[PDB]
Ligand binder design. Structure first.
Ligand SMILES: [Au+]
Ligand SMILES: [Au+]
Ligand SMILES: [Au+]
Length: 323
């Protein structure tokens, strides 16, 4: 392991103040320009709009355009300019640091896996929610596809087992992951119709493609809102907060480009312009940065450290999502 945060210290501990419980939703394939709050022509995010204390960040750029590239960068100390995907697995990352300081780290996954991020930590702290062995919400659609909302089921038991400790829970979403946007949501979120149902996105009627994509966003709005609602049930005993950031955007036929993964050197804007949301309870003392702060995935690591009152010289000056 190559360390950059051996100086990390927690200024206040959970035995001397309210313990902190945070959910970080690691989003998948969501575009900033398809969010209602960013100026989109459709109400793709209605449930989040009914919750007080949610900050929408209108200017967030992802480290890259693929899950394998972006996800390790999101938890890196190095920042996008110095990040190396091929050696990321051997670097101390922000979750290693928090775990060493006693924060209880949980990673649930309905996407694929942590892309290296969890590899140094006990495997018991990673759980696969793509399979019904763990996910109880798969039989809600004709595909028997495990849903993101299934990752909230049983978190109270996790909280009960970590009673009184600081907790950081990562929920790695399937979210809008393609090309089969139409399989990413249940019938209740099929509001924009008709929808594209083929793997050849270029042959699908363009409007029908956008419709399927936006319906999947409604399913993600629902999931994020339910994550906040779950946190709201522990607001008296814990300082609760929720961070959402998508790993990268998506092309939907602009200049003939579909799906994601374009090399950063010529990646279109829509593959790197991502939504981010931050929610916190009024008691936590956490203050969001301005909604239009120029932000990137580099802000995630300092946000997570600040949420748990942790300092580290490597990201001392780095802009975060919160003050
Ligand atoms: Au669009
Ligand atoms: Au992704
Ligand atoms: Au179109």
């Amino acid at each position: 392991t190559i360390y950059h945060a051996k100086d990390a210290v927690q200024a206040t501990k959970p035995d001397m103040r309210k313990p902190r419980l945070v959910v970080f939703v690691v989003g998948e394939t969501a575009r900033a320009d398809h969010v209602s709050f960013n100026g989109y022509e459709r109400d793709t995010f209605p449930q989040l709009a009914k919750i007080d204390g949610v900050t929408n960040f209108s200017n967030v750029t992802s480290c890259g355009t693929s899950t394998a590239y972006s996800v390790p960068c999101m938890f890196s100390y190095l920042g996008a300019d110095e990040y190396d995907v091929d050696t990321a697995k051997y670097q101390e990352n922000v979750l290693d640091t928090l775990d060493r300081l006693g924060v209880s780290i949980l990673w649930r996954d309905n996407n694929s896996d942590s892309k290296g991020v969890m590899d140094k930590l006990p495997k018991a702290q990673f759980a696969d929610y793509k399979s019904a062995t763990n996910n109880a919400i798969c039989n809600t659609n004709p595909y028997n596809e495990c849903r993101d909302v299934g990752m909230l089921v049983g978190l109270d038991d996790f909280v009960a087992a970590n009673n009184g400790k600081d907790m950081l829970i990562m929920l790695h979403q399937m979210g809008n992951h393609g090309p089969a946007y139409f399989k990413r949501y249940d019938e209740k979120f099929a509001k924009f119709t008709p929808v594209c149902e083929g793997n050849e996105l270029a042959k699908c009627e363009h409007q029908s493609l956008i419709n399927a994509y936006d319906n999947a966003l409604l399913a993600t709005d629902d999931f994020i809102a339910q994550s906040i609602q779950w946190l709201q049930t522990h607001s008296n005993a814990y300082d609760v907060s929720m961070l959402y950031v998508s790993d990268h955007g998506e092309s939907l036929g602009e200049n003939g480009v579909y799906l994601h993964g374009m090399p950063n050197a010529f990646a279109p804007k829509e593959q790197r312009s991502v939504p981010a949301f931050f929610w916190t309870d009024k008691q936590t003392g956490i203050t969001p940065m301005a909604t239009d702060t120029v932000l990137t995935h580099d802000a995630i690591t300092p946000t997570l450290l600040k949420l748990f009152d942790v300092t580290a010289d490597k990201v001392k000056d780095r802009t975060a999502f919160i003050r």
